[PDB]
Design a protein around this nucleic acid. Structure first.
Ligand SMILES: [Mg+2]
Ligand SMILES: [Zn+2]
Ligand SMILES: [Zn+2]
Lengths: 1202, 468
RNA sequence: AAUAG
């Protein structure tokens, strides 16, 4: 229907065209008949009838008279919904300045007229005159006159000049401006200017002036003469129960405006003294400002409730505004909510849904099937049958929900796995049954959690639920590619208990024909689960090439391991099961099943694993008791020794040998060492036991203690928590953060006393408060990321670019922090991977790196590769599939139409709650910094070289001595400048000292051309530069934190990308969060979207102008095709908030935040929104240009092309 | 330095000094002097005195209101009859000596001067005062328009030479026709337009019999008088703005803001200045307080409520509140409606009516319960919406009715369709249904009855029975 | 406001 949204100023004629009448009275409704009053705020003659196809007269009262205007009343015979669309207007007695174009800084009226805002308000507030037509006089336009001076010069000159005061004066000044003449004048003055401040001022004003010329807007439209009036049904006056009426504040504001306008007209008719008229004009301006934006001018007008009235700006803006409350999110039909319980019998694609809840949700479907099969004659009969709850209704409900998927949601929806589709199974009850294996995806536990349920209606929505959102499709984490349905808690415990090994168990040494006979022996009490036996195992191995090799052989194992092998799918080794299975081992089993067998086998295997784990956790009888907390006997001796040595240190303090700080430090170290020793003794005592073997000797066995089993299996519990249960609680911190000298020398088994419990509460409260506040901080960060990255969609397959990024193993010392395989898995090669010391092309260009090619890279000892990146993609809009690579949630190359920006933002934002020289290897030494290369050729030690045993190339043997989490991420993604940033070498050249000017110092550099560049340095700067040295560009002169903007300016796009990615990944890896770097690269790409033009060239770009990079690239391609001088630009790094606010579309920018500024700028500019991103199409109700809608939008782009 | 319009208004008002008794009498005297000059200017008009004479002729016949004729008498129908008979006699004398003895003759001037003296001892109602002013204003303005059109057409010095007495005389036209300056060819061409202009001028001059000099003198005198009266009135209003503020300070927090009350009081003060009388000896505050109070309170009665209540009901509500407060003080508990009705000497039903119509609308932003992020407007339904079940039932009924009609004879189906409006814009009575083929009301009625009888048979009505 | 996740 429509292809774009156009915004701009409104002329008086346009406002009159919108209007169906003029509001002349502040009347709303009669106080007896409750009918609209004529020419009032609710007039039926202006806005439409109050009843469908009726008039206030009651004369024309049917559809026979549609479109006929009653002569007695004037009310058109039509529908009542027209009162939601018909607008009105007020003819203002005096012009009024628009508050947005006056006080939304910077002021557009002031910028256009080149007069300060204070002067404009002085003219408006009737304090100072201003010259409109200077005439044949020394007076100039825009020069201010006081009343005294105005009277003086009125006597002096007379009618030669015109001087006015108020909004009429500003309108006359704006109407008399010659815009092309001003544009020429600013261009000429910019040609012959040197100061950068005046250059900025003239470039801003010139941009405004030429925007006004191009848009067709006239400046005097910024001063209102006709005021539009909203439809009444959008500001309703509706009756409540008991005769009370509820009204909108807009009615009060409009009534104030109308009353003051009528009083102004009456005063002008009475020829009142000028002071009264000036007062009335001030009040009219104040009333209109309050109606448009309350509180911007001054004291906000308040109603009888003593609270500020809500204006139109408040209608459209804010968290509670129309954009966010009603347009970006809505309340929906066919939805429900209930508490969630656990269904351990369900399959991964099934969810237990209550019968009554399904009956309410699927009601139209039940009506349709009752009508179809003849059980109900009409729809009212079907309604009666459903209300009476007949058995045939239940059969119809089963047939309806037979294969209809349903969507389950849990708030907060931190990532897309917070909504998944399931096949419903009708259950008796009122609680939703949720599959256990999906709980980790939902962050859902059964302690009172509630879930919402939605019914997809159309066939497309049903197929989207089945194909995309179904739980069996989403078993990999889109953030990292790791499985997300890994078993936890009881399952793991069961699999741990069944696969453990016991010495001299019943049935040891027995020979078993296979898993079935192991199960038979277990069920007959012949052998225990933990009996060491020999079992004939038939194992099938599916190789990389697809070879299926079957080998039968006798393996030493346990009964439980074979019984578990019974459910393992064919194609996997028995070594994955022939061990004790903790959480990590089961994770490995599922990962190998996915990597070597597929998706269906993995789903069946996961279901069987969870069934078996539950069953054998039940059969184990694992229980927690007070005797399971074994406190070591060494704890008391260690406490006594620590106390005695603390007394000795106190005695030394009283002798003056050591200071107070030393005493504090060594007491703390004493207690920390004591805690470590007690923990070690407790773990050693709890981890082992002594058993009698078959020969009768004593053997050491791993303990079957319940708490030890729970912790070791990874089901629940860790070393620190067992420490607290059976060892020492340890040193605790004060609310400010300092450590208390005496620790809690008691565990939870013994019980704390009052002081120890109070000290514990000190830290417990801090933890809870920190969680509560970081929730809001993380939410705001995630929203900002989603806004900045919402437009990134895979639009092509290959962009045909040769650029890429250099990838190397991450070395932060003597060990690898992360391997090259983990970084390269899923990325497309950009330059051929030649074998080291050889010219054979091991891996060609444009090949996805999967597990097989990762093993190939690892075997041949390759250090540095080059891969395609989203930051270096050349696509005009969005990115292409090759520059992105593998879709982590799907395992293959990313498909066209995938909204990867939203995925990146969710992947980064979801873990925000969790957020708070001697050689060690043998090889040679290479200098660049210090690098220690192994014999294979891989770089394994990267060390700094401050300004050495072995020189360059000299081999070194091992042992030779050659010689704040979430705020940090937010500051990195906002491109914040550090407080004391490092001073970097602006240009490459020879350093030279300079004249130490008072206050702060200066230095100079001589370039290769002999030109001298002067740098300004603060006094307190430990300069690392020496005269006569040719410092390269980007070299550090003064040490300090590095600004990302300086990195971009002096090193390039790759350097800033690496910096941001490394810092963010350092923060995330400190806490153990696995997030792929392509998400951070997508965000950084959205950060590098603007360029400032340095050379104007011949393209339609002004110097010093911040414009979109894609537009410049397209223009440069066109100009090169035309063989003309291209534009020269410097790319800019913006924060995610600033980048979001500086997008091309004003709908998205307004929907994000700062609605008034965005709308004011768009209105003065006359912007046009093409609806190219997701948010715009969400707001206007259209299909998003991603995924299933992608193709649709493409088709339209063809039809517009044709 | 400030943004509050209240503070700016006080700054602008404070710069005016306060009057004294002598100042008030002096300003009132200036107002009266200006009004007297205007009255004298209007009196020197041939159309003015006959209008007053005929108004008195109708009034003395006891057919018109006496107040509408005159409002007072200046003293340095017991008496009005004598003075108006004197006025009639002197008008006859002036008409006798207006032109027979000579316009410059002393009779025509002395009679007019003593007529001015007689008319100075009259206080007319302001309505016909403005009525007489407007006619001469319009005549003078039309003269201005014609003169400016003539100047625009001709464009100088020649007109300035003969503007004094020959502006409208045909001697100027003849002399222009005689002139032979190079630009007088186009001037002679424009003489055709100037002919129609001056012909239009002739009717107005004979309507006045004053030519141009006399009307110009009268216009200047009237303009000076109005300017002087306006200046004096402005001085009085600016002096008493502070009294307006002092009065309006007491009606805050009654639905109107402070500046609205100030402006309504200012309008009341201007109306008070329009009708002050310093001969009475009372000071200006005494009279002006009443008008300021009245203006402010009428403005509150008319503009303090979203739903407007008439003034009489506003008084009833306010006096109910006062009586309820006195009774609450008297007995110590809230007065029940019957006791209030007995004290008001009004029915209890009227008391309840006044009680529920005296409540202001609630805001849609008011929080619900103890919440602060909730709003009342978030919980208001749209009772005008149609349930989708009802829409589906309507479509089903349409389909069933069509199927049932398909089982009938086409004539009966069409007759029923026209008589009930099915698949048609309008319903039809028996007459126009007869107009189809045979115009027969008794026949159409019979066939409609037959169709209803067949549709009432249980064989073809079980489908439609389910919709009841 | 309070409460649940
Ligand atoms: Mg929970
Ligand atoms: Zn009507
Ligand atoms: Zn690309």
């Amino acid at each position: 229907e429509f292809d774009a949204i156009k915004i701009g100023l409104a002329s008086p004629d346009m406002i009159r065209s919108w209007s169906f009448g003029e509001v002349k009275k502040p009347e709303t409704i009669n106080y007896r008949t409750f009918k609209p009053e004529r020419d009032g705020l609710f007039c039926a003659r202006i806005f439409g009838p109050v009843k469908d196809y009726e008039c206030l007269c009651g004369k024309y009262k049917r559809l026979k008279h549609r479109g006929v205007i009653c002569e007695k009343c004037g009310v058109e015979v039509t529908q009542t919904k027209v009162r939601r669309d018909r607008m009105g207007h007020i003819e203002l007695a005096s012009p009024v300045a628009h508050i947005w174009f006056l006080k939304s800084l910077p002021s557009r009226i002031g910028l256009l007229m080149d007069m300060p805002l204070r002067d404009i308000e002085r003219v408006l507030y009737f304090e100072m005159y201003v010259v409109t037509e200077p005439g044949m006089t020394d007076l100039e336009r825009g020069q201010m006159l006081t009343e005294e001076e105005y009277l003086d010069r009125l006597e002096e000159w007379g009618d030669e000049f015109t001087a006015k005061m108020g909004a009429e004066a500003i309108k006359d000044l704006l109407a008399s401006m010659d815009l092309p003449a001003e544009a020429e004048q600013m261009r000429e003055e910019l040609d012959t200017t040197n100061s950068e401040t005046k250059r900025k001022k003239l470039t801003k004003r010139l941009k405004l002036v030429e925007a006004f010329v191009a848009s067709g807007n006239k400046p005097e439209w910024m001063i209102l003469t006709v005021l539009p009036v909203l439809p009444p049904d959008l500001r309703p006056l509706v009756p409540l129960d008991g005769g009370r009426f509820a009204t909108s504040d807009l009615n009060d504001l409009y009534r104030r405006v109308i009353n003051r306008n009528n009083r102004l007209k009456r005063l002008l008719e009475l020829a009142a003294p000028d002071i009264i008229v000036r007062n009335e004009k001030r009040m009219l301006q104040e009333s209109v400002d309050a109606l448009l934006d309350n509180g911007r001018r001054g004291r906000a007008i308040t109603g009888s409730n003593k609270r500020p009235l809500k204006s139109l700006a408040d209608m459209i803006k804010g968290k509670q505004g129309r954009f966010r409350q009603n347009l970006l999110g809505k309340r929906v039909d066919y939805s429900g909510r209930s508490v969630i319980t656990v269904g351990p019998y369900l399959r991964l694609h099934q969810c237990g849904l209550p019968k009554k809840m399904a009956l309410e949700l699927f009601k139209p479907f039940i009506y349709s099937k009752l009508e179809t099969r003849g059980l109900a004659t009409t729809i009212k009969a079907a309604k009666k049958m459903v209300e009476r709850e007949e058995a045939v209704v239940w059969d119809i409900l089963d047939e309806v929900i037979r294969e209809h998927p349903v969507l389950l949601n849990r708030a907060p929806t931190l990532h897309r796995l917070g909504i998944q589709a399931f096949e419903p199974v009708l259950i008796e009850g009122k609680a939703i049954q949720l599959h256990p294996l999906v709980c980790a995806a939902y962050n859902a536990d059964f302690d009172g959690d509630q879930m919402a349920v939605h019914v997809p209606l159309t066939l497309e929505a049903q197929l989207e639920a089945r194909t995309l959102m179904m739980s069996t499709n989403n078993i990999l984490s889109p953030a990292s590619g790791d499985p997300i349905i890994v078993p936890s808690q009881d399952v793991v415990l069961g699999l741990y208990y069944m696969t453990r090994e016991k010495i001299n168990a019943k049935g040891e040494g027995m020979y078993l024909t296979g898993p079935a006979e192991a199960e038979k022996a277990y069920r007959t009490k012949t052998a225990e689960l933990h009996a060491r036996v020999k079992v004939r195992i038939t194992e099938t191995i599916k190789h990389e090439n697809g070879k299926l090799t079957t080998e039968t052989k006798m393996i030493d194992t346990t009964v439980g391991r074979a019984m578990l092998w019974q459910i393992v799918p064919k194609g996997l080794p028995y070594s994955l099961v022939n061990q004790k299975l903790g959480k990590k081992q089961i994770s490995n089993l599922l990962n190998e099943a996915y990597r070597k067998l597929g998706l269906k086998d993995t789903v069946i295997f996961a279901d069987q694993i969870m069934y078996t784990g539950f069953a054998y956790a039940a059969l184990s009888g694992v229980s927690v008791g007070i005797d399971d907390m074994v406190v070591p006997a060494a704890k008391y001796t260690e406490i006594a020794e620590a106390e005695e040595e603390v007394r000795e240190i106190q005695e030394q303090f009283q002798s003056g040998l050591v200071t107070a700080g030393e005493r504090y430090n060594k007491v703390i170290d004493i207690w920390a060492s004591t805690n470590d020793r007690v923990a070690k003794a407790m773990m050693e005592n709890l981890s082992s036991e002594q058993v009698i073997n078959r020969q009768g000797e004593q053997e050491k066995q791993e303990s079957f203690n319940s708490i030890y089993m729970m912790a070791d299996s990874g089901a629940r519990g860790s070393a620190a928590q067992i420490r607290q249960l059976a060892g020492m609680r340890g040193l605790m911190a004060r609310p400010d953060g300092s450590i208390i000298e005496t620790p809690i020398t008691a565990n939870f088994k013994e019980g704390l006393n009052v002081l120890q419990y109070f000290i514990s509460t000190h830290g417990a409260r801090k933890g809870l408060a920190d969680t509560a506040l970081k929730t809001a901080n993380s939410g705001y960060l995630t929203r900002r990321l989603v806004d900045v990255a919402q437009d990134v969609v895979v639009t092509e397959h290959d962009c045909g670019t040769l650029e890429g990024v250099v990838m190397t193993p991450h070395i932060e010392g003597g060990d690898v922090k992360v391997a090259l395989t983990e970084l390269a898995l899923g990325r497309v090669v950009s330059e051929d991977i030649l074998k080291p010391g050889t010219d054979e092309v091991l891996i060609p260009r444009n090949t996805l790196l999967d597990e097989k090619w990762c093993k190939v890279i690892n075997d041949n000892s390759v250090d540095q590769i080059k891969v395609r990146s989203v930051v270096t993609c050349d696509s005009d809009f969005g990115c292409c599939a090759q520059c992105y690579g593998r879709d982590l949630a799907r395992g293959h190359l990313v498909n066209q139409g995938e909204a990867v920006g939203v995925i990146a933002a969710q992947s980064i934002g979801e873990p925000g709650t969790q957020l708070t020289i001697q050689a060690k290897n043998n090889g040679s030494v290479k200098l660049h910094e210090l690098t220690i290369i192994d014999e294979f050729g891989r770089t394994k030690e990267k060390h700094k070289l401050p300004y050495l045993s072995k020189a360059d190339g000299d081999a070194v043997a091992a042992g030779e001595t050659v010689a704040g989490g979430l705020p940090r991420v937010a500051d990195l993604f906002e491109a914040r400048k550090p407080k004391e940033p490092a001073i970097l070498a602006e240009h490459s050249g020879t350093v030279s000292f300079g004249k130490e000017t008072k206050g702060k110092r200066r230095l100079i550099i001589t370039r290769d051309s002999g030109d001298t560049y002067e740098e300004m340095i603060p006094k307190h700067r430990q300069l690392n530069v020496f005269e006569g040295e040719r410092i390269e560009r980007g070299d550090v002169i003064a040490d300090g934190p590095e600004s990302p903007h300086d990195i971009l300016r002096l090193r390039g796009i790759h350097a800033v990308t690496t910096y941001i990615a490394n810092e963010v990944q350092e923060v995330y890896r400190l806490q153990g969060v696995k997030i792929n770097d392509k998400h951070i690269e997508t965000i950084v790409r959205q950060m590098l979207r603007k360029c400032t033009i340095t050379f104007a060239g011949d393209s339609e770009f002004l110097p010093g102008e911040t414009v979109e990079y894609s537009q410049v690239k397209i223009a440069n391609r066109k100009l090169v095709e035309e063989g003309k001088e291209p534009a020269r630009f410097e790319r800019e790094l913006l924060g995610i908030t600033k980048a979001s606010l500086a997008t091309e579309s004003f709908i998205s920018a307004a929907s994000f935040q700062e609605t008034t500024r965005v709308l004011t700028e768009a209105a003065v500019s006359g912007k046009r929104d093409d609806l190219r991103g997701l948010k715009e199409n969400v707001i206007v109700g259209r299909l998003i240009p991603a995924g299933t809608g992608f193709a649709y939008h493409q088709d339209r782009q063809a039809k517009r092309a044709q | 330095r400030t943004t509050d319009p209240v503070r700016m208004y006080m700054r602008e008002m404070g710069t005016v000094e306060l009057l004294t008794r002598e100042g008030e009498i002096d300003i009132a005297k200036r107002i009266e002097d200006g009004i007297n000059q205007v009255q004298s200017a209007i009196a020197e008009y041939p159309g003015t005195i006959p209008y007053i004479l005929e108004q008195f002729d109708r009034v003395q016949a006891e057919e018109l209101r006496l107040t509408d004729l005159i409002s007072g008498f200046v003293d340095p129908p017991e008496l009005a009859r004598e003075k108006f008979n004197e006025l009639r006699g002197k008008f006859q004398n002036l008409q006798l000596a207006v032109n027979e003895f000579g316009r410059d003759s002393h009779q025509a001037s002395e009679a007019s001067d003593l007529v001015l003296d007689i008319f100075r001892e009259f206080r007319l109602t302001p309505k016909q005062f403005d009525h007489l002013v407007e006619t001469l204003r319009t005549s003078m303005d039309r003269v201005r328009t014609q003169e400016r059109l003539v100047m625009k057409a001709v464009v100088k010095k020649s007109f300035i030479a003969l503007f004094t007495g020959n502006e409208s005389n045909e001697e100027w036209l003849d002399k222009v026709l005689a002139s032979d300056k190079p630009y007088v060819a186009k001037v002679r061409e424009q003489e055709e337009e100037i002919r129609r202009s001056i012909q239009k001028l002739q009717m107005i001059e004979q309507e006045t019999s004053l030519s141009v000099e006399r009307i110009k003198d009268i216009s200047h005198r009237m303009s000076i008088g109005e300017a002087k009266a306006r200046r004096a009135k402005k001085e009085m209003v600016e002096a008493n703005l502070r009294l307006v503020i002092s009065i309006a300070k007491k009606y805050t927090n009654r639905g109107l803001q402070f500046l609205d009350l100030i402006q309504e009081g200012n309008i009341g003060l201007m109306k008070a200045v329009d009708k002050f009388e310093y001969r009475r000896g009372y000071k200006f505050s005494t009279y002006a307080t009443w008008w300021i109070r009245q203006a402010i309170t009428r403005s509150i009665a008319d503009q303090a409520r979203t739903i407007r209540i008439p003034v009489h009901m506003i008084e009833t509500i306010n006096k109910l509140n006062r009586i309820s407060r006195q009774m609450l003080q008297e007995m110590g508990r809230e007065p029940l409606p019957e006791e209030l009705a007995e004290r008001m000497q009004m029915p209890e039903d009227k008391i309840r009516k006044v009680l529920k119509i005296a409540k202001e609308p609630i805001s849609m932003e008011t929080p619900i319960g103890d919440d602060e992020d909730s709003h009342l407007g978030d919980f208001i339904e749209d009772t005008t919406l149609e349930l989708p079940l009802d829409s589906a039932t309507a479509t089903s009924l349409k389909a069933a009715t069509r199927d049932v009609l398909a089982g009938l004879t086409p004539r009966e189906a069409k007759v029923l369709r026209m008589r009930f409006g099915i698949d048609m814009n309008t319903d039809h009575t028996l007459e126009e249904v007869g107009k189809q083929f045979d115009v027969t009301r008794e026949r159409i009625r019979q066939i409609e009855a037959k169709a209803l009888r067949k549709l009432r048979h249980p064989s073809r009505s079980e489908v439609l029975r389910s919709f009841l």
